[model samples]
Target: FVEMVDNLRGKSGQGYYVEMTVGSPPQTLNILVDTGSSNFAVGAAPHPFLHRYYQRQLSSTYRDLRKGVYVPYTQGKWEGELGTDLVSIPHGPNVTVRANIAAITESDKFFINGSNWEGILGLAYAEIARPDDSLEPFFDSLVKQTHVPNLFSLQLCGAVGGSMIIGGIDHSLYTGSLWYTPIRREWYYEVIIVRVEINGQDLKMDCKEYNYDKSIVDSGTTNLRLPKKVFEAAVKSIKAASSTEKFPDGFWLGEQLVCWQAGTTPWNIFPVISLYLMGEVTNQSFRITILPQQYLRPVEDVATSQDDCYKFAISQSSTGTVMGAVIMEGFYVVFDRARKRIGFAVSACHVHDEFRTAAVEGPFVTLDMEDCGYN
Candidate 1:
């Protein structure tokens, strides 16, 4: 409950965050751990929702960069003054780096009811950072200054929270060799996924359709948003083939929720959704599947009332597929920056105790396809 992150409740469902130790006397706040943006902005002025603010007056080492930083996300917007401070992750690398920060002085619905979340730490690339590509991002600054590995790994445990390993992989949190795919772009954690399979049936469309504009892996997002074409195919492919036990057409269209009496097993009725990710060789491929338990999310408060209605987690994106928290929860993700590749493995926390309990399958044999990349 203490780790709840909901500043973007209107846009992205709830996100997760970590404790960031900033400034001289060590001011701490539950900062949102976003892999979607590239700025480390925190509250510098008082707000009605934030429990605390990053008081520049209290930090003797804080410096005013004399620049302004402003960003408008898919949901919220904020403007701040750029500054520098000694920043260190309490749960990550030990050494502190003088990192660039945006001391947010103003915002609109960007700091509301986050439990204790008072800031955002964007681990994305410099191209998307405030003030443009010239400004180095938080992780880039840390790696360059400390000479650590230019890699970071993340894992989400659904509700209890999880880990974010900066500069390298955490061997203990993953099993076997990591499934590595080349990062297509430096902006978002962009990667090329080959195609979609509903309950193991291929959408049977061109692989390029899956990567229309671009596909990315984002920790801040909520659902796996597929491109318009992919979403349409997925909806038809899944509901038709899976033989769902009589739910309305509106349910598949994201118009309504389906309810089963509490204490009943509804997971058995739905099908699995798998995304085939391309390997470094382009031709080589592997599959990461999401079980019904992950996508058919139950409304927690309403479910407790004895009748559980679960909202669908996968959705349609106008642009491209976004592997958000719902799908990412199924595996451990690695942002191997220096090597410019992302890795996936069965998370140590993603135990399938409830439904479709099985280990993820490895690389697959080719099915007469070439080059499923965005290079």
Candidate 2:
């Protein structure tokens, strides 16, 4: 299986990177793994000086598509040229696959973060690919062209090393029964949300005609991002649930996280948040529970205090609600594109095993077991 590790050095502590090779001779490169977009791009020289770029002169099988791509994000955008090359992933069922890639000519300061990752590998559907959605993604090439399974599992362990299992699921990385949900759309692993709750109280607000109940399971995003009104209400609920002691400076730690001083952090004091997803027909709904450890993360600074400073790491997203890395790290998630369904079970990150799920035929199968615990 293909394996990857989380780069905790990032300010958000949310991204994971995988090592891949390009060209005939093969130049190894580190790429940031993303489920939000569908463009595999490498940075060129002049800006992000810390990382390496793809050089066409070094590859024997490089082809210039002569098409330019502009990928935009809330923070910034990436401008580059589209090209094709022989890409290879080590230790997977299928190692090498011919795919379309982006050679980044330039980028705004928003993408100039200090990191070793040189490029981004988008794992979403081909429909979201920039310039032309018809272009195939790397993983799509692996499954459709290279004859690999349409399944992939993500096991992110925060700072410690994690892995991405291509073509199949690693049963040892998770426990209990695997719950399944149909993908509402193939664009971005989009799933239907029945409702969201904090300690059994519904936090869903009526945003006039806007349907903000949908969720996009994104591995590239750093926090559990919600809309403006939804975010304020959720944070207010969290503050009400937390104890009196908070960060001496204030609650808002910059734009993303909320902090509290050492010994006063809201770990056990805060209530559990749950996201209920619409399940398959003839079965019950699936629940994704989030505990304090998954959402409340530790920051490096604490001044003279011995205990660490913890932040309520949820943010506001302008593009609806996004189930990002913070919540996904606690579970073993299987993106089953073949059957148009997604699976989830409690993750077992501290241990590793080559466990397998029972064979099933047709659309999908419901395991005869109880729902997995949140912890």
Candidate 3:
């Protein structure tokens, strides 16, 4: 089991991050935990929003790689130079690894006010490593240092109540059987989605709509992003199957926030969303269910919104299906590097006041639809 020490924090709105010692005499910086990228970049320059940035000059083990690197997120981008520095998470394995990082010199909206973190720590394959794959990621460095046959599980609880098991999956964090999907590609933590369902009824749209481009599980992302077609179909299905809620289309668009009158709970009004994905080994499919609370998120968990305000947690994606925070938070996500598969289990912490927000269904004794295979 892993503990949240002084260095690691999962301040909401952004992604989960860890406090890590960088350089030799290690000045610590809170590094944003990201799986969508492979660049261990930091806010190295003075910025208005950054109360404290990495002072690269103070590090004894810092070596400038001089390779230009810029990482672009859906909202912001950071430009910096690559380098190798000694990095260690005191709360993790008792060891230090000299790893590559991008010392960000300039950025756009990457860092904002109330941003508790100072840098980004990517936990993906080196194939997506900034500048090139020749540079290994921080996790890779750590694994190479002490090959404990790495696998890190992440569980995001209410707002800031979350922690990453840097290695060694914590059994107590989740319940039920863990289902897995083989990594489809190396660039991202890509997986397969056979179809979408709402309240157990299949959306029945063209399978191509869900697999337009690719599918990935990224913790840094805020919501469950679906392809444009799939999102439209899902919203239509939810509305058709559930009782009426006075929410505008913009609410499902991830643009507007909704709140119910005092004493009325929206959780009782929203419907559940289920995703059937290809199994790692079984020819059959396994489903990850997202309850209303997971998709129709509590506003306070996202912020200090009014008493009953809830934020819509599903959005449209231009390129592919992305199972982001809204979806991942309800389940314990296991990034199994050793096995080349990703696993999910019902998170023990996903419940609020004894209400469950996530569920996992079978690696059912049914095959994937004809031609609905991983592309």
Candidate 4:
């Protein structure tokens, strides 16, 4: 099994990154670990990051496929040349595959310049890649060439760091039995979120009217993004708390950045949100708990402010809901491509002492220990 821990880099942990050595004699590159897209790219010239591009000239193993590649994201699009090479995780086995690597020639401001991260290593399904230019994802290629188990686990620590388990599961990271939910589709770790609840109250059908009621599990996004109507309902429910005060229009800050007083216990004022999912593998209703701390994020900057303008950290989406890092923190996630399912469990960092002991000391099973019945 290829096990490696990646550093959570950037302000407020914008992304997690792992080291990759591409080309012959290996040139080290820091690549962002992304599950939202399906392209592996490194910055070319004019890129401000310290780690330079995967120097094709420096490595003899580099093979030019003479293919043009373009990848678009919410921020901007990356245009480059695609080719195959020897990609390997250091201190581990090397695998040569016909995978695509972008020699990024052009990008926009959102392309993340002047950061520790130089590029992105997309872990999403190959179906989401650029049309016709869709290449096998690095992980999938690794699985095929190495004959390792096609299971990988993620354990992210808020702003600290996390481990990515390639070809295996780490029992030490999570507690209780691992529960699996089938991917609604192969693209973007997509899944069916059956219901969304706030303070034990289910969101009515009005919130579900949009076509974007489907949920996509994304590790790249920093905040939780829900369908437009659903997001409004969530903010309304969260504002019902006595400690929260709605902010004024044109406040320069974002709409989610409303006012909230200090010294107020958030949990005492706010209610927990729950996500109900139809689990195919576990054959039950899987519930994901989101606490007040997860949503009531504090915004440290304001205009000479005695009262803090706090950001709700949740936003409205036109397309579909995104279960981002904020909601998934303190959880161990397993992406099981072999079975076409994703698993989730409370991490040892979030659970009680006894459960943590059980998780770290040994035997973890796939049994559905908790009933997942809907309310």
How high is each candidate's TM-score? 0.90, 0.84, 0.93, 0.82
Clashes of each: 0, 0, 1, 0
lDDT of 4 by residue, 293-333 (tens): 66655555556266655556677787688888776677788
- Cα-based lDDT at residue 98, candidate 4: 44
Tell me the deviation in Å of residue 272 in model 4. Answer: 1.2
Q: In candidate 4, which residue pairs get closer than 3 Å at backbone N, Cα or C atoms, i.e. clash?
A: none
- lDDT of residue 96 for candidate 4: 50
Which model, 1 or 2, shows the larger TM-score? 1
Local distance difference test scores for all models: 0.78, 0.69, 0.78, 0.67
Residues 1-375, model 1: lDDT tens digits: 112211122122457777787899999877888888899999889999888899999999999999998889776899999989998776666688999989999999787674457888889999888788888889888988996788878877653467777766767776766788888889988999886788878888878888877889888777888989888888777677557577787787667887878768557667778888888774777778888777776665633567777777789888678888887874778899888999898887674755475245567767676565543
lDDT of 4 at 238: 63
In model 3, state the lDDT of residue 115.
69
Tens digit of lDDT per residue, candidate 2, span 116-232? 667888999888888877888888887768667888878777634467888788776777777788887888888765556676587755422012645688888767888677777
Candidate 3 overall lDDT versus native: 0.78
Which is the better candidate, 2 or 3, if ranked by lDDT?
3
| Model 2 stretches astray by more than 4 angstroms | 2-14, 110-113, 204-213, 246-266, 301-307, 350-375
Which should have the higher TM-score, number 1 or number 4? Answer: 1
Instruction: Give the C-alpha miss distance for residue 108 in model 2, angstroms.
Output: 2.0
lDDT score, candidate 4: 0.67
Ranking by TM-score: 3, 1, 2, 4
State residue 264's C-alpha deviation in candidate 2, in Å. 6.5
TM-score of 4: 0.82
